[PDB]
Design a protein around this ligand. Sequence first.
Ligand SMILES: *[C@@H]1O[C@H](CO)[C@@H](O)[C@H](O)[C@H]1NC(C)=O
Length: 130
Amino acid sequence: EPVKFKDCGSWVGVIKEVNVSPCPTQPCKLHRGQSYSVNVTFTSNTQSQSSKAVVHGIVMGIPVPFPIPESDGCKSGIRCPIEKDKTYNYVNKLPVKNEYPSIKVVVEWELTDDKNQRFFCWQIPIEVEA
Ligand SMILES: *[C@@H]1O[C@H](CO)[C@@H](O)[C@H](O)[C@H]1NC(C)=O
C-alpha cells in the first residue's frame, strides 16, 4: 500500500510513491520474522552508472544501520545506467528479524548515485511487534 512519508533530502530524484506491503493501516506495523515488500517509484533528475541503497533504523532516537538483502540499486529493479528524466521502481525487501526488539522505529531509506547524491531519501514511522 502507498504510505505517508517524509522526504529527508531527495536531490537528484523525485519521489512519486513509497509502497510498503502488506501495510493496511499506518504507521505500518511489522511483525518480527516477516519481510515486507518495498516499492519506491521515483523520477531521476540525472544519470548514473551505479546506485547504492543505505537504510537506517532510528531506534530510541539513534539511527542504526538496517540490514537489507541487496544494497546495489542496479540489482533492485533499476535497469542501469540510470538516465535523466526516466521513472524507476526501486524494489527490495525490508526484513524484520525475529531478534529485533518490539518498539517504534523510524525507517530511513536512501538511494545514492556515482557522486553519493541522493536519488531519494525518505522516512516512515513503523511499529515492530511479535
Ligand atoms: C512497483 O510499483 C509500480 C507502480 O505502482 C508498479 O507498476 C510495479 O509493478 C511495482 N513493482 C512490483 C511491486 O514488482
